[PDB]
Structures are given as structure tokens and as C-alpha cells.
Ligand binder design. Sequence first.
Ligand SMILES: [Zn+2]
Lengths: 126, 59, 136, 192, 79, 49
Amino acid sequence: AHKPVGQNISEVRRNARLRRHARLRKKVAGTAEVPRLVVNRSARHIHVQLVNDLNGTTLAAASSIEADVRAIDGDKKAHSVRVGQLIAERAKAAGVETVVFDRGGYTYGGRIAALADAAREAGLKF
Amino acid sequence: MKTGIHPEYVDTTVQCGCGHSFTTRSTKQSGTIVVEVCSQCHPFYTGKGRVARFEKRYG
Amino acid sequence: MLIPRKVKHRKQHHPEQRGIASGGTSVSFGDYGIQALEHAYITNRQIESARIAINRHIKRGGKVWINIFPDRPLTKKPAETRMGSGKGSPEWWVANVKPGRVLFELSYPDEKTARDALTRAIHKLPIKARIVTREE
Amino acid sequence: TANIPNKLTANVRTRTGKGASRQARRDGKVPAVLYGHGTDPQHLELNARDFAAVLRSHGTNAILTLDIEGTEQLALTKALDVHPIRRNIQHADLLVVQRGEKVTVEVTVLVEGDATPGTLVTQDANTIEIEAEALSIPEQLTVSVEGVEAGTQITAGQISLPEGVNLISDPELLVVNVVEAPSAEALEEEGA
Amino acid sequence: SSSRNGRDSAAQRLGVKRFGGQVVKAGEILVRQRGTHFHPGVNVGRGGDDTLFALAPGAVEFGAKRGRKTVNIVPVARP
Amino acid sequence: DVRPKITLACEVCKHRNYITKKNRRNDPDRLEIKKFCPNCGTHQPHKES
RNA sequence: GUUACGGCGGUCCAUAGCGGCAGGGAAACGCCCGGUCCCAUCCCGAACCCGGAAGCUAAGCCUGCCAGCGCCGAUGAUACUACCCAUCCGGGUGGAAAAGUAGGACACCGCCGAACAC
RNA sequence: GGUUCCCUCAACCUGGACGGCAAUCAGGUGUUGAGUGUAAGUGCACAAGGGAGCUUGACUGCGAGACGGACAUGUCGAGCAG
RNA sequence: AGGUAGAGCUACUGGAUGGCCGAUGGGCCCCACAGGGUUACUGACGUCAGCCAAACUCCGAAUGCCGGUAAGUCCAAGAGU
Ligand SMILES: [Zn+2]
């Protein structure tokens, strides 16, 4: 019988991110007029959503799991630009033109900053 | 590793009194050191001039 | 004489003398006990006089429990002074007793000497009281 | 161990409250409640003198068979409300039980015998918990202090229980603590 | 001798000014307090000295969110 | 006085726009700080008199 | 539409938690490999960041069963109380606890997305 | 003081040269018992508590609507422009 | 919206009764040191049972207060502003 003594770094990392995501969400919130752009990052992919916090409903969502994004022959940040452009097309196809950015806890920079600037040049303003 | 805050660090080479040699990295600017006791020399690992002064003049 | 080591507040209002006792209305340790039938402030001087009276009757054997403690101070202002200028310094410690409370207990091998011993203690207290046992 | 249920006549109350319960007591009655796995509590009334006679000769854990408007019902006495001063019985809880059911019950332990002449007996715990059949609850539990010398902690796990009765409380309670009898100097220093 | 006591300070008239269901204007004071015994809710702000005031006209409504007592302002629908 | 009252003046128009306090033991020198000068209409360096 | 699946939220925010036993890797979620580049350590690529895909569900995460601990908790009775009778005792109409008992309970609800099916 | 970002204490158990109950180091338990310049109270772990970078809003012209009030005083405030 | 009456306390801060266990101290004997048992001894920590508080609170009324609403009195309260 094996009995681990402490906490794996995965558990420490996970609870620390949710800790600093809630500290973020004490200010930003989603409304139908000005939705919220939630981004989730992993070691393989990146996800975005447009959430309306008034009733807890998701408007549009783009992700790196889509077949067309996988075909890109760049690095991880090259797929983040592709994912950012998809959400901007889907955001404006539902009448949304202004959003607020929810970085999800992660540091703003690198992959996250690549996605946001891809969705800024594509029409969304935030 | 920050740029200009750490001691200058270069690969070295240790040579013992039993003829053993290693290939390690340390902080010594010389590039090599010589030691008379190693893992192969000290009695506690192996289990095997004052001594010579009494063993030469007196026997 | 029983005296608390320290009380947080030295000069306190008078303990209220309304209602009947909520807890302590039963015998837990000994075989016999003294149950109160009136409200009063039982001073530590009366408690000491009332457990010595129990001691002098059972002599050697038996055990005595005291279920109340003089926690609450009553102040007295200095003699022959006009009213006013502060509140007096505490003098004697009392225990707020309500009807139904069990004050003393006793554990002695025979009944007549134990019931007689508790009666000597009742005559030292400023209230009506009775002797109770552990049975319903 | 087998018991015979005690017959009592219970009348269903019409009005409940503090005014109605006080009036019922003045007429020589005790309000009572019959809950349990019936899961629909009945607010009953019992004759004050007849109910207390059953308690006198059978103890607090008395099995009862009640007559509610012509229908019988096995009941157990769960708890009693007693005035501290008047020693009344202001209320009573009745729990519905059926034959063969196991119920956890507190029974009294009694001390008997005559120990060493130089010792004093001090019983610490008045009751211990058991778990017996509906009709197979002992009316008392007996321990013996005979020839017991000096300091001995009689323990709850050393009490001779009948068949079909299992101790529920932990087996390390201190029930009877025989001790050397205090002297005239031990009396004086204790309590000052 | 004498007494060393005898001081006190002016009562500050703290407390709930507008109660549940009571229609208020914008900027109107709802609760005066020291700490956040009551936290702000929707359309309610917290002042410099922890005063809760309405940010929009409506009706007062007390709630509870994540273990915290809150004060909320709900709109009144025009006829 | 340890904490005296000091007047901060614009370094362009020499107008005395603000008054505040400082500890002349922790800050033996004249306090230098930027504040809005209404006469100039923009944030300018203000230095203690 | 199906799932021992992944995000984002809610409940006058534990009936949802702690603990124990047995199980899962389809895509995802993770540990994991390395420090060329954006970036970083009051020292340290541990962390934050970046580029990947040899190993594993051992941990996080998720599923099922437990009532040992915490949690919720009546009916009835009592304490207390507004008004009213009552010459010092007390009572009537209305309201009604805290503790305890029978019990409940190893959560419930909504929007998107995956793999498969249609 | 302003803002942006990061963090979780006290106590207890175990192992360590001077070193001891208690200094610095390491692992575990630990949901607030520590801390908040300063009395007490109301709050604060979502931190208002600990750490770091830049900084001067410790502004100018104003201020719908309110609290409190013998009067004179006193207090809160969204929002507009520079 | 409250924290009074009541009640409750391993739910906090204090006070406090009796058992059980047993570190720490006087030690005694272990020839002086570390090396083990002993108490008419002192007894932490923990635990079982019974309690107390204007400046204690995990709880918690009846009244009173603020607002809405439907009526009542209405040739009068001889009301309110
Ligand atoms: Zn100027």
C-alpha cells in the first residue's frame, strides 16, 4: 500500500489558479450588451467563450480543438491567433461588438496576449 | 539564472592520489583540482609525515 | 472560604432573583442532597459554616460535594457617608440561588446519620430547603 | 427476559396548546405524543394516576399497550417531563415499536453488597446504554461490591448483561469507584 | 474618594434608514454603519465611512450571497 | 514642531497652490512633488517654500 | 440523442463538508520532457513563461457504496412575553423559543463544448 | 497615500553545528484562534492582513439625491469637464 | 432590520465542582553522572459528568419601529400638514 504524503503540484497549481480567477471576477462581469471573454489555457489547447453572467448563458465559443485550427503548421501561439479570429467572427455574427476580457487567472502575455490581439485586429474592441 | 549575480562557473577535473579522475563542473577558475582522498581512498568507504617519521628514524 | 482567583469585572449589578433554576436541579454525585425552595444570595461564609456542620456529624467517613460557588461580588460603600461619589468597593461574594437548585451533596454509608447531618446544614442557610435523594 | 405490555387508555386530544394542556393536567391527565415509524404523530391523553403507577412498578423504560379509540398500539416510553419542584409529570413521549425491533435504551445500574470495612463506595455513572428487543429490556442492572479492597475502577464493560443485550456505551466508563474511606483530616481540607 | 469614570461620546444615529420594499431615489442613504455588517448588492455602493447608498431608483431589498448579508435595489416598472 | 505646515509653489509661475504637512526629521529637505497648477493649466513640479 | 467527459455560473451557499472502501483515460483535463526564442527567481526554468509528446492514470479530476465526525431538524411539551382578570398566591386569550427526540442527508439546477450515434 | 500583480497566517508534531521552549533551514497538520500605527466596538482569509514595480488624486471648476439635526455646526454621494 | 427575555457553551472570552489518565517538579532508593520503580506528594495535556456571566454568544422570541395595502370612524376625530 502506497500513501502519498503531500499535495501533487497539479493540485497546488489548480487551486491556486481558481483562487486568482475569483479575485479577478470580483470586478469583471458579463452582460448581454457587453459580454465577458473567458479564456482557458492548457498545455495543448486554448479555449474562449462569451458568457452572459446575468442569466449564466454562453453566447459563442471558439476553441483549438476544431479540425481547421489543428491544420495550422505553426507553434502554439500560431494556433492562438487562429482561435482569436474565429471568436471575433462569431462574436459579431451575434450582434456583439464590445466585450470585457477575462484572462482566467493566467498571466496576460504570450499565448493569452496573442489571442487577445488577434481578436482586437479582427473587430472586437476591449 | 540571472546574468551578473552569480560566481563564475566552469567545468573542472579532479585527480586523486589513487589515480582516479572525474569530469565535473565547479567554481574554481583554475580548471582542475587535485585531492589526496576520494571515495576510493578513505578507509571508511573501502573498509581497509608523523607516521613516516617514526617509521624511518626509529624503524 | 471559597473566593475566585480573579473576576474580569469587579463591580457588577445585582444578580436577578426571578424564575426557578434551569440546571443543577438534580443529584449527580452523592446519594443525598439539599434542594432550595426560595431565592437568596448564599454567601461563602454561610457555605463554609454549612459544610463544617456536615463534617462534625459524619466525623470520619463519607464524602461531601458543594455544587455552587460564590462568584458574584456585592459592594458596600464606606460607613456614615452621604449618598453619591461613586460606587463602593466589593466586600462579600455570593451565589445566586433559585428554587430547585441542589446546593450540597453527601455520600455516607447509613441513612439516618446522613439525613441528620444535612439538617444541621440547612439551619445555617437563609432559605427554606429540603433533603432529596437519587430516586424518582 | 420477557415483559408484558401495560394496558393504558389514551384519548385523542381535541385542542392543543399551553391553555389546553394546563386544563388537562388540572383534571388529572398527562399530554403525550405517539411518534415513531408511524410517521404521523398522535396527540393523546393519559390518566395521570394510572400512568404513574405503571412507571412505579416497571421503571422509566416501560412498555405500554394503548387503546386509541378501540385500536391497540405497542408503545415505548421515550422521555418524561418532570417539574423540578412539584415532581409532576408534565409531558411524555411515546415511541411506536413492534415485536423484534431493537431499541437503544438507558437502564439504571444498582450497587449491592458490603465491601471491605475500610473503604468508601462512590458510584459515578447512574445509567448505561444497551440495545435489546422491544419486550426484552431489563428493568435494572446489578453490580456487586463484595470483598472489593482499596482502589478498584469497576468498568462499564464488566457489567453482567443478560442474553440478547449489547452494551452501546463505550466499555471504559467508570461506573463504581471503590476508594479508601476519607479521614477527619481529608474531610477538612476538601472544600475550603 | 471620587469616581474616575463619567465620560461618554455622542450617539451617532447609526442604523438602517430605508427598510425592505421602501421606494428610494438615486444617491439616497440606505444603511449607516461602521464596518460591512451589510455588504453592497446590485445598484448599491459603499461610502468612505462604510455607508450604503442607492445607485439607481427602485425598491430596497435585503438578500444574502455567499454567506454575506447584502442590500439590493430592484427597479419599479413604469405604468 | 516636528510636523509643521508647508506651502508648495509652482516652479514656473511661483504660485502658492497647496499647503500640507511633513516631518522635518524624516524629510530634512524641501519637499519636491508634482501637482496640478490652475494658472498654468497642467501638472507642474511643485517645491516647498 | 448517449457518456465513469471538459469549461462557465446559481442556492437566503455544508441536506452540498471531512473521513473510509472499490474503480476510469474515447476527445479533453493532468502529471510529464526540455530550456533555442517572448518572459521569470528578493538564490533556484520549483514557481511564472515558452517549444513539445517517450511514460502514466500513481496523484489532481471524475464514478459507485458507506451515517464514524461535522451539517439540517420537526410534532408535542416547557421557558419567556403583549393585552386582560386578580387586595400581597396565581390565572385567561394570542404569539412562541434554546436544548433534546423521531428523523433527513455522501447535493440540486442552468448555458456552451467534446467523442460516438442519428 | 494611488494603482497593478503575486501570497496565507498563529499554534502544534518531526529532523537538523554551535542553538537552548523560543533566532535561520526542511517536511506534515493547520479556515482563522495570528495580524490590522494607536482605546474599544463593528469588520476584514474574497482579504481591509504579507511582498514587489511605477507613482503624487494628500487634485482644479462642480455636484442630482440624502443622513443628522432648537440654531450654529457635522456627514455620505453617483456623475460631468480640465 | 435587530440581539432584549429565555437559553446554551468541545461555539468564543472569562469564572468554576468532582472523577480518570499522565508529562513536568521534591525527590527517595539506582555507589557521583545519563542508566528503573516509589509516593499521606505538586500535578500540565487530554477526557467523562454537573454549572455561571450588564460590558460572553453557535442561538433566539413576544412587543415596539419603518413601508405598502384593504377597510373603519367620517351632519367627527373637532385629526394630520
Ligand atoms: Zn504654475
